[PDB]
Amino acid sequence: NSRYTHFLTQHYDAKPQGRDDRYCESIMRRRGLTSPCKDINTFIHGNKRSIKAICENKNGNPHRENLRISKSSFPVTTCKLHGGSPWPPCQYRATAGFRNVVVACENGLPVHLDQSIFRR
């Protein structure tokens, strides 16, 4: 999947520093999500092997018929736009957690992250 590599650029960070507000503003810039400022974006941490495994029994179960929910929890960081302005420089607030994730899978690869679960 070109979709998988895209999912990775939008939602995967193997080496997060701080996972604080400073981290969010920096990563959102690095991943090209500041033109205009994405309103919310979650990054998953850890190794890619475990995220891929959500698409199979190894680390997932079916969810909402057509999605997958992880067996394991993952370190995550949700970056939420702060201050209203949709143009850079973008201000973000970080919410770090350790929780299961829901993805859509195509051909054994995650291609979409369900953002709805990180609003809460």
Author numbering: 3 to 122
Question: What does the primary publication say about this deposited structure?
Answer:
Like RNase A, ANG cleaves preferentially on the 3′ side of pyrimidines and follows a transphosphorylation/hydrolysis mechanism. In addition, the crystal structure of human ANG has revealed that it has an RNase A fold and the catalytic triad (residues H13, K40 and H114) is conserved.
The residue Q77 forms part of the β4 strand in the ANG wild-type structure. So far there is no assigned role for this residue. However, in the Q77P PD variant structure (which contains 4 molecules in the asymmetric unit with clear electron density for the proline ring, which is less accessible to solvent) the hydrogen-bond (2.9 Å) observed between Q77 and R21 (part of helix α2) is lost thus creating a hydrophobic environment.
